[PDB]
A paper describes a structure:
Two protein molecules were present in the asymmetric unit and aligned along a noncrystallographic symmetry operator with the two α/β-hydrolase domains packed with β1 of their β-sheets adjacent and antiparallel to each other and the [name] domains clasping each other. The two protomers showed high structural similarity to each other, with an all-atom root mean square deviation of 1.01 Å. Two stretches of residues in the α/β-hydrolase domain (residues 493–508 and 572–574) were unable to be modeled in both protomers likely owing to flexibility in these regions. In [name]_ct, the positioning of the [name] domain relative to the [name] domain is stabilized by hydrogen bonds through several residues: the main chain amide of Ser383 to the main chain carbonyl of Gly451, the hydroxyl of Tyr361 with an oxygen of the carboxylate of Glu452, the Nδ of His360 with both Oε1 and Oε2 of the carboxylate from Glu639, and a salt bridge between Glu390 and Arg644.
Interestingly, [name] in the D. mossii PUL 17 comprises two individual [name] catalytic domains separated by a small [name] domain. To assess the role of each catalytic domain of the multicatalytic [name], the separate domains were also produced: [name]_nt (45.3 kDa), comprising the N-terminal [name] domain and the [name] domain, and [name]_ct (43.3 kDa) comprising the [name] domain and the C-terminal [name] domain. [name]_ct forms two discrete globular domains, a ten-stranded β-sandwich domain consistent with the [name] family structure (residues 294–393) connected via a short linker (residues 394–404) to a three-layer αβα-sandwich (residues 405–656) typical of [name] enzymes.
Numbering used by the authors:
A (entry chain A): 294 to 494, 506 to 570, 573 to 656
B (entry chain B): 292 to 493, 509 to 571, 574 to 656
The structure:
């Protein structure tokens, strides 16, 4: 087709890319001297030369949600000049948003809004400056005798602490849930899933030390938190989900809620003994933990699906109580993770 | 002749070796692009890289001036972000940037001092009927000192940039944190918004500031909401906007700053901004501070505009501070220096 709507991820003033009927995407770029121009969106497409040095292609229908993508000039993968950038795939990378019909819980609404703030701290573990983003709920500044539970929320491999604020649209998701009475007012802390102890010789003891010895005490000191395990949760996507289980299950005195979004799991050991025998007494474990949540997209790559799905099945066989969610029609991509946060946050602190 | 090694720039993404800053502040770029026909880097000027053995291209630049520089990689003439570097919103797109340090200069670096916070606030504008976003710096101790109220600086970016400019390119939180911690600047709130506003039914930006941003900040934050505790400043375009908005709303502002911008004009300088300073002597008692800055190395047209604005102020007897930033051009180090100076003068 030809008439379309500019993607919401376009830089201001950029009319292309445009989403056509059927969620095909029309890409254009001016590159008169280029030898090859491709777009990598689900798969690689060669653009075709058009008039006055421009190239264009119309993709197959693109599945609804958020997708990283690249323009390739002569095989060199780069950010599209026409789109915003995100930290993903271990660099700055383009992303494109394909709207869902009749879904708007991750969109901005005229409801009371929280705030995402940037906090900087020097880590003694890593001997480096670090940065976290902290969501506070609407009315935080005025309700000075109110305190709040805290969710610690982590990004995936190749991403960083800007992931949930940007790709994850987390402030809209949480703003809307709280405004509709579906989630309790809560603080959300988004840090970086990488940590290097320079003196040291998906498990990372440095990251665990950073969380337990630095981030949690800092957040509990700078914010009006309810600083106990019944009001503290940890969750993450992919790598961050493995980290959430590793850190929470070896520090159950600090957390009663844990979530893995397309992450978590593992001959594979003696499942009975995972995380230093944390659930070797299943009955006691089930009453220590208020929530274990696992999610996966139905369309994820087979080995990713199997890892989380087999984790789910081991919980069933052992009788470990948990919530299990398959996101219909999505893969190892951010819409799976927005859906997961939406469900998980509704379950927290109840 | 032989190859060299250097220090990876602080703007590199984690693990990325290049660019490296060599001795003399020459910069070494090296990129894998085996199937490309031409690879260039645009940093001050364009350089052609030389294809090496395994499809790697490399070039060493001339000495690069200290400070922050936008740059691009060009593959077959297509200007893109360098995959090796972080990105910034500038030149009306996402673009690479590179930082070249100044030895012994660190007022814009992170120090072990009490730190403020930059927070994101959203609001829906009646003028533009679109969701907008501002970044608001609150000084160290803001949450704990609930009885304290604060003066406010409205701080604007340049043409082709956006509200992320001062937090990122500007390193503004380090600059203000450090001034406050050293007792050189009073504790203050800094508001950074977007310098573009379009009325869909069609100044729109002036109404956004006067009717939306300032009332929103005064309601959401513990501000001292009067002109003696409200300032406005900006760089390039943002400096022109600061003068236009503040000079037509002097009831709202007592301090105004233009960093490489501000000099609207062969006419009657005495009549500018609807005769705001026609009576020079009452103007000088109404305004606490006029600040103008420029880099000595800025393009001639840009230097003359600000310098001539300053000289018109001098002829008319209008009190103001004028600073020429030595050796810097129309680039962010000039504006980091300006904010450092300007914030010291505010609310005193
Ligand atoms: Cl991962």
């Amino acid at each position: 087709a030809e008439v379309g709507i500019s993607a919401s991820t376009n830089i201001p003033g950029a009319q292309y890319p445009q989403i056509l009927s059927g969620n095909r995407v029309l890409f254009r770029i001016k590159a008169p001297d280029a030898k090859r121009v491709q777009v990598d969106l689900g798969k690689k497409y060669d653009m075709v030369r058009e008039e006055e040095g421009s190239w264009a292609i119309t993709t197959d229908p693109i599945v609804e949600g958020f997708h990283y993508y690249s323009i390739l000039i002569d095989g060199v993968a780069v950010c599209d000049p026409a789109s915003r950038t995100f930290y993903g795939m271990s660099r700055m990378a383009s992303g494109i948003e394909i709207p869902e019909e009749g879904v708007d819980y991750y969109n901005l609404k005229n409801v009371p809004h929280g705030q995402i703030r940037q906090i900087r701290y020097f880590s003694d573990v890593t001997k480096a400056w670090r940065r976290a983003f902290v969501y506070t709920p609407a009315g935080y500044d005025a309700n000075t005798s109110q305190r709040y539970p805290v969710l610690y929320l982590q990004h995936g491999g190749g991403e960083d602490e800007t992931g949930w604020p940007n790709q994850g649209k987390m402030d809209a998701i949480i703003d809307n849930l709280i405004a509709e009475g579906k989630a309790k007012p809560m603080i959300v802390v988004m840090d970086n899933g990488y940590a290097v102890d320079p003196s040291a010789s998906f498990q990372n003891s440095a990251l665990e030390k950073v969380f337990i010895n630095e981030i949690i005490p800092l957040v509990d000191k700078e914010f009006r938190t309810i600083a106990d395990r019944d009001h503290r949760a940890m969750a993450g996507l992919s790598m961050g989900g493995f980290q959430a289980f590793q850190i929470a299950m070896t520090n159950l005195d600090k957390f009663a809620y844990v979530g893995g979004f397309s992450g978590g799991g593992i001959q594979g050991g003696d499942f009975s003994k995972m995380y230093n025998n944390v659930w070797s007494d299943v009955d006691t474990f089930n009453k220590r933990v208020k929530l274990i949540y696992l999610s996966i997209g139905t369309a994820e790559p087979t080995n990713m699906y199997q890892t989380v799905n087999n984790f789910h099945k081991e919980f069933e066989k052992a009788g470990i109580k948990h919530v299990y969610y398959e996101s219909p029609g999505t893969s190892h991509e951010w819409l799976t993770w927005r859906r997961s946060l939406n469900q998980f946050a509704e379950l927290l602190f109840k």
